[PDB]
Amino acid sequence: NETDVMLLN
Amino acid sequence: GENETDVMLLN
Amino acid sequence: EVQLQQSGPELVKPGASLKISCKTSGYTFTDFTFHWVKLSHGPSLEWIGTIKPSNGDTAYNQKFKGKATLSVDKSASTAHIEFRSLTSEDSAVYFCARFGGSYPYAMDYWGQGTSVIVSSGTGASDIVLTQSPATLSVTPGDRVSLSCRASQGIYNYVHWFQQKSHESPRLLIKYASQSISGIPSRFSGSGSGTDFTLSINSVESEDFGMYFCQQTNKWPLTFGAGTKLELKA
Amino acid sequence: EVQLQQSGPELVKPGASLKISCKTSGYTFTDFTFHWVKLSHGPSLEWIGTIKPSNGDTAYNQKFKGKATLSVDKSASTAHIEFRSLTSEDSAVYFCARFGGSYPYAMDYWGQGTSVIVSSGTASDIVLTQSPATLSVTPGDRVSLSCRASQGIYNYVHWFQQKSHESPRLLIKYASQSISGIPSRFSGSGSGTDFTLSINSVESEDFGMYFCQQTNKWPLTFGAGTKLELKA
């Protein structure tokens, strides 16, 4: 889940 | 024919 | 209140055909000829052709004869332009305009323009109009004169337009020196034959933009390359 | 009422630089990442990149890294994209979108798009396969649209409707989650690699392009789209 830091948190 | 556009544009 | 409303932005594949429209309101559609104008970088304006809505007569700029077809739908009070075999060279903003108003007529009302994108995926005797200076840097309050020189005598068949960024051209002066309703008194025009001048008595901050001259004495109708009026550093 | 308002149509010379803007209203600008999307013929959608407005962090699609720069003006609540060395290949409609709404976030609000004309004068990326490429139906038919991912992406699939002369509209997020205001006839299912968008009964207002999108891995990618059209 490499995009979560940028997109969801 | 010094006024060639007159028929189309003004009449 | 007269209005020319153009259809929305278009994006097509190379080789495609495309029909774009110009719908009128507030006046009798069959009154005046309709004109299509291509805007390219500079900005630069080119006249494509004209259609007389009352009888369907047309006159094309030979450069666009194998590319565009003009038509009218009298039942819908709508003028159309259809392009064929579209290429990257056809990506441009296209304007419709009527040639009307009080006699003698001029390009008084214009549509807002249609952006046409042709996506890359994932005339020996035409009248030449020479505009000078190409760029004029001024301070508000300055008196300015813009020159338009015709390649041969065209009597008083010169019209002046102002074009501001993201806006359609606006008629300032018609037939070299005739004033237009609502245009501020600081704008005036003079000349006959081959030498034409647009004067701005005292430039205002709202005057910055492009100024084009246009001749309507000979086919095809042509424009000057324009004078870019800008603020001095 | 949330709104993303893009700057007007542009027409430039080849080799020029151009900065286009996206201004927000109705919410706190620093809340959600901003995304830029390129629309080309088909229609086809490509993701250019994203910017986090709270701190300025970016992630780009490598295809656009040498072409576009994303920035934000927090004082003006405006997101920007700047293009350099523009060519005919860059003529397109560019959309801005925010990745927000109720948790988990998705591309819920979009700008109206900016037409950019560049005038001629006077490998490891997730592949999304959409099928059938065309669905020619009569209103009242029940349809199913497939999106197959090149590798497992859990539930990180979102569905968009795009009608002629309009901006993409979010229909379903995270494979099956419903979106406020979207009619009940739209539903989604699937996990891993096989995803389906179902339309219970096609309406005349449903004709247009349908795209799936994955947001599990960088770069974010779209399928090539399914055209839903009226049977002749």
Residue numbers in the entry:
A (entry chain D): 532 to 540
B (entry chain E): 530 to 540
C (entry chain B): 1 to 122, 138 to 248
D (entry chain A): 1 to 122, 139 to 248
Sentences from the study reporting this entry:
The hepatitis C virus (HCV) glycoprotein E2 is the major target of neutralizing antibodies and is therefore highly relevant for vaccine design. We generated and characterized anti-E2 MAb DAO5, which specifically recognizes a linear epitope comprising part of the CD81 binding loop and the E strand of the central β-sandwich within HCV E2. We show that a synthetic peptide corresponding to a β-strand of this Ig-like domain forms an α-helix in complex with the anti-E2 antibody DAO5, demonstrating an inside-out flip of hydrophobic residues and a secondary structure change in the composite CD81 binding site.
Three independent structures were determined by using the molecular replacement method with the previously determined crystal structure of the unliganded scFv fragments as the search model (scFv-J4 peptide, scFv-JFH1 peptide, and Fab-J4 peptide). Superposition of peptide residues 532 to 540 from Fab-J4 and scFv-J4 peptide complexes confirmed an identical peptide conformation with a root mean square deviation (RMSD) of 0.136 Å, calculated over the backbone atoms, which together with the unrelated crystal packing interfaces for the Fab and scFv complexes indicated that our crystal structures reflected the genuine conformation of the polypeptide chain recognized by MAb DAO5. In view of the similarity of the individual complex structures (two complexes per asymmetric unit [AU] in the scFv complexes and one complex per AU in the Fab complex), we selected for further analysis those with the lowest mean temperature factor (B-factor) comprising residues 532 to 540 (indicating the highest degree of order). The peptide interaction with the paratope buries an area of ~730 Å2 on the peptide and ~650 Å2 on the antibody, with a total buried surface area of 1,379 Å2 and a shape complementarity index of 0.801 and 0.774 for the J4 and JFH-1 peptides, respectively, similar to other antibody-antigen complexes. Unexpectedly, the peptide forms one α-helical turn comprising residues 535 to 539 (DVM/FLL), in stark contrast to the extended conformation observed in the cE2 structure. Residues N532-T534 interact exclusively with the light chain, forming an N-terminal contact region. The α-helical turn of the peptide with residues M/F537, L538, and L539 establishes mainly hydrophobic side chain interactions, predominantly with the heavy chain, forming a second contact region at the C terminus of the peptide. A detailed comparison of peptide residues 532 to 540 with the corresponding segment in the cE2 structure revealed that the short α-helix observed in complex with DAO5 folds as strand E of the β-sandwich in cE2.
